[PDB]
Enzyme design. Structure first.
Site, PDB file in Angstrom:
ATOM      1  N   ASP C 328       1.000  -1.601  -0.268  1.00  0.00           N
ATOM      2  CA  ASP C 328      -0.114  -0.010  -0.042  1.00  0.00           C
ATOM      3  C   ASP C 328       1.076   0.829   0.075  1.00  0.00           C
ATOM      4  OD1 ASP C 328      -2.293  -1.451  -0.212  1.00  0.00           O
ATOM      5  OD2 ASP C 328      -1.903  -1.640   1.686  1.00  0.00           O
ATOM      6  N   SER C 353       2.213   7.266  -0.716  1.00  0.00           N
ATOM      7  CA  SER C 353       1.821   6.660   0.900  1.00  0.00           C
ATOM      8  C   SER C 353       0.145   6.760   0.291  1.00  0.00           C
ATOM      9  CB  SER C 353       2.039   7.524   1.757  1.00  0.00           C
ATOM     10  OG  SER C 353       1.347   6.469   3.066  1.00  0.00           O
ATOM     11  N   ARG C 354      -0.440   5.768  -0.241  1.00  0.00           N
ATOM     12  CA  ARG C 354      -1.538   5.830  -0.672  1.00  0.00           C
ATOM     13  C   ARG C 354      -2.702   6.061   0.700  1.00  0.00           C
ATOM     14  NH1 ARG C 354      -2.325   2.884  -5.345  1.00  0.00           N
ATOM     15  NH2 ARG C 354      -1.177   1.392  -5.872  1.00  0.00           N
ATOM     16  N   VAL C 355      -2.783   6.283   1.555  1.00  0.00           N
ATOM     17  CA  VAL C 355      -3.055   5.880   3.185  1.00  0.00           C
ATOM     18  C   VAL C 355      -2.131   7.357   3.346  1.00  0.00           C
ATOM     19  CG1 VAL C 355      -3.108   6.156   5.463  1.00  0.00           C
ATOM     20  CG2 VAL C 355      -3.711   3.820   4.031  1.00  0.00           C
ATOM     21  N   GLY C 356      -2.743   8.264   2.609  1.00  0.00           N
ATOM     22  CA  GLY C 356      -2.723  10.443   2.857  1.00  0.00           C
ATOM     23  C   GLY C 356      -2.892  10.493   4.283  1.00  0.00           C
TER      24      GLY C 356
END
Ligand SMILES: Nc1ncnc2c1ncn2[C@@H]1O[C@H](COP(=O)(O)OP(=O)(O)OP(=O)(O)O)[C@@H](O)[C@H]1O
Lengths: 124, 105, 528, 170, 50
Positions: C328, C353-356
């Site tokens: 991810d 970072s796809r989790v921003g």
């Protein structure tokens, strides 16, 4: 171990040791790797390398040469040798063609002891 | 024998006829080695005595007396207010000196 | 106690062994453990890799290979591989078979199916690496497997190692449920690097909340194949205990090399770069076990920080091209920057970072929203401008001031990272030079000029308590209570530095004093 | 009487948090309490507001985190992490009875500055703090201000003029 | 506008030679695997000998 002295170990060179098993691996029946190396490369290399290490009883200041065929660092034989070292001095054809010796590329090499605690801060 | 037939009973097969084949072992001076229906059991002084040898080794290895025994845990200092009142700023230096002494001295 | 045999060894090739069975009625399952009797005293464990029609068992060896000979007997345990598990493992390193190694009950499986989607949760909590770069532009949340790329000697290992030392100050304070633990996993690295890591984590009292798994180079290949698996199992039980847990791999490319060595020695069908087919499955069996579980499943979490070694900044390699497609996000390091004093040597363009934001806290979102809208223009300006031209604009000033703050040996506390980045993004750090930025930061954080020089028009807000982050994390600086106090503390510390220190600095146009100062700056770069 | 509560995916959820609260109030140490939120969560009976409040209660009443002491122990941070866990992670918001335990611990520890922070926060959310704690807060404040304990000693110390690495204690 | 044409021409030659190299490594490996098996091909040979 027994004498307790310090020791030097100059080796010229590891790559011939690697290819020595490469010439035989295909004949043993072992299927070869990508470029044409044995599949047992990292294991035989580690079982050779790990013997080279400081101990409580003494110390081995090893120095190892390597053949980088075609000046290709991506060759897996030098590449697997990075992890088993503390000072990865790298030489290059380019710096020598300019008439400089020792043909070192300071950027493509680096040491492990380059810390402020192990050595002088000014040197760092 | 009493363990042989019973192990033949414990085996997945027991209706089959039992057959014995004995041999002389130079390694074993005590106990026996048995194999029944691909179920081996070793009762041999080589392995039996080596079992307790391994336990008597690990027991001594488990405890090392060269190293200092761990000291009792120290509770929070909880310095009294009177100490701060008497010496407003020196107290911090005293605490730091005591901690440094506890590390070095 | 009676054991059960199946046969003897037909032949061996280094780490590999083939089996000739006896009593052909008997069978063996696929991935079970086998115990070989090298002698009546010593016994070697092994795993069954494949089976054949003729009746034979391809086996990978894990201990005491040199003692193996042909004609030896084999026994079967009847179960998968498993290791001792529990809370009694945090302080000690181990072999992936659980054998504790010297240094100067419950069992658990290596191959458990990863949690399905219903047994999971979207990530909402953070995981503080302690570095300002990561927690700003490419944050790592819990259950957010994130890769670490880079060539040799760029700062890959140091990142995770600071990620773990950062989680010692906190885990002492917060409860024993939200205390992110950690497991290092070294594969093929030299054994002395392991002991140096052991002494490091034991120096900072971090090993109380951190174990290591070590399958060194001397260890066989099949034992390198299982190390991240057993480390994941160790994190899986903590996930089942509701705890949080971190997980590191140094590194997977040697795990793939070992799997290659085994498949090719077992006469399995090779593919690209001599790897077998299922290597993408080999990693997906592992990484997808990393997740943020649900409140129905304890709310546990397993964070994975897989390291992979690139070669000459290539990414089209098979392993890296696969691990990137799995994770991810990623972190891309550049040795061109590790040499240029940018340590850590991140590469913000290629790093993802796809989790921003959803991982970050309430205090970080407002900051990172500015930093993205600062570096986005810094790169365009530094890319288009020349190397020597002077440009007086707040972007090229503030951003380059930020790049210095990004440089740091070791981790950094949360409170210090926010106050240091809030000072820049709002423009308070525009008058100081590029060089003394870290000394300014060092004075701001550990020292306190307004407390020293009498400026105490600040009821509570000071940088000496360090328990104030727990208000920042809750309220955030944009709240009306911390905004003015913060701005007054920063403006005062800025004027005091610009007046007292920053003037004295430029006056030292001597020989020895310049070196005396440059050592101070390049030391402040390190302690911070 | 009990309003229904649903999981993320819409599944039904238990709310009978009673016996877990009585199992928390018996917590001799304030770490078995955090270990009980696990047992609640795994039974599909997540924690209510009163539940986290009881956690804060035993955090205040208990003496230590575990049987042996621990370095880096702090009751205040352990409570604030609970608050962050309540607000942003899950969604439940605190109440005045929740912040009361926080302000009480800031009074016991004597950290007056964080006391004025928690005060300025409670008054922002629209909460009535007990003046009895504000009085003890300001009492400790003036008590420390008169004795020079308003700040530590190592901050007021003289600045080294020279730019020496050992002078600054780096 | 000229540098871009030279760049795409080099990107094609690079990305094409990378593929030919990957394929070549496969040919070498499969050649060794096929040679080992073809030489090691085992058969019953249930034929008269006396
Ligand atoms: N911010 C920093 N400041 C100063 N030195 C740093 C910083 N970050 C890393 N280092 C140095 O980098 C070295 C560690 O290198 P690193 O662990 O990244 O190599 P590696 O990627 O593990 O090598 P390999 O890939 O062969 O394992 C240490 O000497 C460490 O002090």
């Amino acid at each position: 171990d027994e004498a307790g002295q310090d020791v030097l170990l100059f080796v010229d060179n590891v790559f011939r040791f690697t290819q020595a098993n490469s010439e035989v691996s295909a004949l043993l029946g072992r299927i070869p790797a990508a470029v044409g190396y044995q599949p047992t490369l990292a294991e035989d290399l580690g079982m050779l390398q790990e013997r080279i290490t400081s101990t409580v009883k003494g110390s081995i200041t090893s120095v190892q040469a390597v053949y980088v065929p075609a000046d290709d660092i991506t060759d897996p034989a030098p590449a697997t040798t990075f992890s088993h070292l503390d000072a990865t001095t790298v030489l290059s054809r380019s710096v020598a063609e300019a008439g400089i010796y020792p043909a070192v590329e300071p950027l493509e090499c680096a040491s492990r002891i380059m810390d402020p605690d192990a050595i002088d801060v000014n040197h760092y | 024998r009493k363990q042989v037939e019973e192990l033949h009973k414990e085996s997945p097969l027991k209706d089959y006829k039992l057959v014995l084949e004995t041999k002389v072992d130079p390694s074993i001076g005590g106990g026996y080695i048995l194999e029944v229906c691909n179920q081996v059991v070793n009762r041999s002084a080589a392995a039996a005595a080596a079992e307790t040898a391994a336990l008597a080794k690990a027991s001594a290895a488990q405890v090392d007396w060269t190293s200092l025994p761990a000291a009792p845990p120290r509770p929070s200092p909880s310095a009294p207010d009177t100490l701060i009142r008497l010496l407003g700023s020196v107290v911090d230096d005293l605490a730091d000196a005591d901690k440094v002494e506890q590390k070095y001295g | 106690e009676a054991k059960q045999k199946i046969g003897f060894v037909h032949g061996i090739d280094g780490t590999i062994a083939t089996i000739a069975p006896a009593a052909s009625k008997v069978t063996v399952p696929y991935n079970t453990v086998l115990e070989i009797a090298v002698s009546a005293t010593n016994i070697a464990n092994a795993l069954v890799f494949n089976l054949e029609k003729d009746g034979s068992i391809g086996v990978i060896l894990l201990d005491n290979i040199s003692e193996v000979r042909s004609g030896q007997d084999v026994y079967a345990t009847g179960s998968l591989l498993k290791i001792p598990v529990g809370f009694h493992m945090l302080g000690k390193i181990i072999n992936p078979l659980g054998k504790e190694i010297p240094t100067g009950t419950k069992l658990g499986l290596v191959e458990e199916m990863a949690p399905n989607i219903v047994s999971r949760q979207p990530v909402n909590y953070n995981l503080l690496t302690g570095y300002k770069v990561i927690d700003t532009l490419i944050p790592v949340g819990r259950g957010q497997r994130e890769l670490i790329l880079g060539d040799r000697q760029t700062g890959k290992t140091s990142i995770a190692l600071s990620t773990i030392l950062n989680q010692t100050k906190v885990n002492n304070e917060i409860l024993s449920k939200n205390n992110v633990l950690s497991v290092y996993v070294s594969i093929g690295q030299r054994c002395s690097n392991v002991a140096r890591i052991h002494r490091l984590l034991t120096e900072y009292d971090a090993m109380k909340y951190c174990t290591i798994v070590a399958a060194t180079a001397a260890d066989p290949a099949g034992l390198q194949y299982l190390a991240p698996y057993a480390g994941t199992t160790l994190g899986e039980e903590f996930r089942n205990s509701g705890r949080h847990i971190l997980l590191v791999y140094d590194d997977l490319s040697k795990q793939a090399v070992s799997y290659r060595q085994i498949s090719l020695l077992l006469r399995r069908p090779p593919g690209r770069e001599a790897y077998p087919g299922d290597v993408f499955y080999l990693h997906s069996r592992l990484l997808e076990r990393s997740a943020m579980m649900s409140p129905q499943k304890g709310s546990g979490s397993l964070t994975s920080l897989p390291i992979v070694e690139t070669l000459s900044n290539d990414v089209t390699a098979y392993i890296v091209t696969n691990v990137i497609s799995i994770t991810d996000g990623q972190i891309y390091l550049d040795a061109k920057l590790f040499t240029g004093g940018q340590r850590p040597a991140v590469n913000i363009g290629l790093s993802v970072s796809r989790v921003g934001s959803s991982a970050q806290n309430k205090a970080m979102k407002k900051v990172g929203g500015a930093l993205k809208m600062l570096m986005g223009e810094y790169r365009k300006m530094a890319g288009e401008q020349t190397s020597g031209s002077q440009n007086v604009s707040p972007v090229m000033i503030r951003g380059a001031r930020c790049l210095q703050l990004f440089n740091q040996k070791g981790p950094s506390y949360f409170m210090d990272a926010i106050v240091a980045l809030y000072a820049v993004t709002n423009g308070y750090m525009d008058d100081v030079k590029l060089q003394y930025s870290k000394f300014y930061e060092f004075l701001l954080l550990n020292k306190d000029l307004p407390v020293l020089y009498g400026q105490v028009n600040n009821k509570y807000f000071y940088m000496y308590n360090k328990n104030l982050n727990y208000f920042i994390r809750y309220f955030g600086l944009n709240h009306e209570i911390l905004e003015p106090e913060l701005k007054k503390y920063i403006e005062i510390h800025t004027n005091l530095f610009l007046d007292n220190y920053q003037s004295r600095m430029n006056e030292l146009k001597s020989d020895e004093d310049l070196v005396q100062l440059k050592n101070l700056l390049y030391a402040c770069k390190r302690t911070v | 009487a009990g309003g229904k509560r649903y999981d993320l995916f819409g599944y039904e959820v238990s709310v009978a948090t009673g016996p877990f609260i009585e199992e928390i109030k018996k917590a001799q140490f304030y770490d078995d309490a955090g270990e009980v939120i696990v047992k609640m969560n795994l039974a599909n009976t997540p924690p209510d507001l009163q539940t986290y409040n009881a956690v804060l209660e035993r955090i205040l009443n208990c003496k230590s985190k575990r049987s042996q002491p621990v370095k880096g122990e702090n009751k205040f941070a352990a409570m604030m992490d609970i608050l962050e866990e309540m607000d942003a992670r899950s969604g439940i918001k605190p109440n005045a009875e929740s912040w009361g335990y926080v302000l009480k611990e800031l009074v016991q520890a004597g950290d007056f500055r964080l006391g004025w922070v928690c005060i300025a926060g409670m008054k922002s959310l629209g909460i009535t703090p007990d003046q009895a704690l504000v009085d003890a807060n300001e009492a400790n404040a003036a008590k420390a201000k008169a004795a020079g304990t308003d700040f530590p000693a190592y901050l007021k110390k003289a600045a080294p003029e020279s730019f020496d690495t050992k002078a600054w204690g780096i | 506008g000229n540098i871009t044409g030279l760049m795409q021409l080099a990107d094609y030659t690079y990305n094409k030679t990378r593929k030919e190299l990957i394929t070549a490594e496969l040919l070498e490996i499969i050649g060794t695997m096929t040679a080992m098996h073809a030489g090691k091909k085992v058969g019953l040979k249930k034929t008269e000998f006396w």
